[PDB]
């Protein structure tokens, strides 16, 4: 079970773990919004080769995933699960957490994302050759930005994205179920305390995050089929472990 004192302690524990494992502080991302890529710089990105742009994005995604891994390890109860279920939860949830965290680096006023020191629109990634996926991710960040998430709200929501008792392959499903339920109580208690329960109906549907990750794996296999040696020789090992089954 859990009393009111224990639920509130869980809230603060989750928010602290998130603060300690956020890649960049929100204030750092906000104070850079005027720093936008020039038209010549955007053109420079569009002329880079497809495989060089793919490995740069793979590198940035891998760095972000590593902070999500540390977030999970600080999450109360996660290290208490068996390592099989720890890996199952991270394999299916790490990318999903990064997609939610991305909205902190997204400026809804001009539809730009902070990328390699400056803000750029989705045309910055045109060399990737997956404009539908990029557009879907930018649209997802746009829908999240309309909610005006606080850092505490992102902390508790991404914990629930990670701790999902429905992931296929879990061996101790009931143990994850109790941890997910405690985090749901903490999330909803914090929304009730802060009069923010109206955002519950506006959160993205369940299949939305899994649809984006499926698109990502789908586009990766298209690129890997065109440049298999590039992936083997120049992609990060953690990236290939999560997304190309290695």
């Amino acid at each position: 079970p859990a009393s009111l004192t224990e639920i509130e302690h869980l809230v603060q524990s989750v928010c602290k773990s998130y603060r300690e494992t956020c890649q960049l502080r929100l204030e750092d991302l906000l104070r850079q919004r005027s720093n936008i890529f020039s038209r010549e710089e955007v053109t420079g990105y569009q002329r880079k080769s497809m495989w060089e742009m793919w490995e740069r994005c793979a590198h940035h995604l891998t760095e972000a995933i590593q902070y999500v891994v540390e977030f999970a390890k600080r999450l109360s109860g996660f290290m208490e699960l068996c390592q099989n279920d720890q890996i199952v939860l991270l394999k299916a949830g790490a990318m999903e957490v990064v997609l939610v965290r991305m909205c902190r680096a997204y400026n809804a006023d001009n539809r730009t994302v902070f990328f390699e020191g400056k803000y750029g629109g989705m045309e910055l990634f045109r060399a990737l050759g997956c404009s539908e996926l990029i557009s879907s991710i930018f649209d997802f960040s746009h829908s999240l930005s309309a909610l005006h998430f606080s850092e505490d709200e992102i902390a508790l929501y991404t914990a629930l994205v990670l701790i999902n008792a429905h992931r296929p392959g879990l061996q101790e499903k009931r143990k994850v179920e109790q941890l997910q339920y405690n985090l749901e109580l903490a999330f909803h208690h914090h929304l009730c305390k802060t009069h923010r329960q109206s955002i519950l109906a506006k959160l993205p549907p369940k299949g939305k995050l899994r649809s984006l990750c499926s698109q990502h794996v789908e586009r990766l296999q298209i690129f890997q089929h065109l440049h298999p040696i590039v992936v083997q020789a120049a992609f990060p090992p953690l990236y290939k472990e999560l997304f190309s089954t290695e």
């Binding site: 590593q66 390592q83 890996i87 991270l90 394999k91 090992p237 953690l238 472990e241 999560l242």
Partner: peptide
């Protein structure tokens, strides 16, 4: 594999 080492 990498995830195993990061969790240790």
């Amino acid at each position: 594999k990498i995830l195993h080492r990061l969790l240790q």
